[PDB]
Design a binder for this molecule. Structure first.
Ligand code: SF4
Length: 190
């Protein structure tokens, strides 16, 4: 009938045609998401930066290369998981997407999670976290590392966005994010 791959391609073609928010006027390429459609763990960030926009691929700039290393140090190959964002189009000057933009784009993310049907989601940063708590503004610093019970018994573990760890190179902060990723892994089923 229809495979996960075909469903994801339908999402991708709809994203490419999307003009539901002002971000479509700014982006060079939409950035849908990448990796393993049978992952039990999905990583979700905010939205594309410059290198993402140029390539159509998520987490390929500086924050993304850091993410690759966090995953490696957590025993995870990027190819084996799925990585995406709340918004699909790069905002002008890489500004934070507005709540209205996040709301317009969010149905695509919900569709990607429905297709993959993971056990656990790692929400990287405040925008991603907001998505999984009905759009509420909530401090990542205050709630990071605490699992959230989301739809269908899926667990969401919020942590810092890798951008933050670009600016603050402390070992303690890195160890905290690695502990959050390991807590995420512990919710993947047998
Ligand atoms: S950011 Fe999302 S809702 Fe906005 S135009 Fe791009 S694909 Fe559409």
């Amino acid at each position: 009938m229809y495979t996960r791959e075909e469903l994801m391609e339908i999402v991708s073609e709809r994203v490419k045609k999307c003009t539901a928010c002002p971000l479509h006027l700014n982006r060079t390429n939409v950035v849908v998401g990448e990796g393993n459609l049978d992952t039990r763990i999905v990583f979700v960030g905010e939205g594309p930066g410059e290198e993402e926009d140029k390539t159509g691929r998520p987490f390929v700039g500086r924050a993304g290369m850091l993410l690759t290393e966090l995953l490696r140090e957590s025993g995870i190959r990027r190819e084996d998981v799925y990585i995406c964002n709340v918004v699909k189009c790069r905002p002008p000057n890489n500004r934070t997407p507005t709540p209205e933009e996040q709301a317009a784009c969010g149905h695509f993310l919900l569709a990607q999670i429905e297709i993959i049907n993971p056990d656990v989601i790692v929400a990287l940063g405040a925008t991603a976290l907001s998505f999984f708590v009905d759009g509420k503004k909530v401090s990542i610093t205050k709630v990071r590392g605490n699992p959230i019970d989301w739809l269908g018994g899926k667990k969401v573990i919020p942590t810092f966005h890798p951008s933050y760890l670009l600016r603050n190179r402390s070992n303690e902060l890195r160890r905290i994010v690695l502990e959050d990723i390991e807590k995420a892994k512990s919710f993947i089923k047998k």
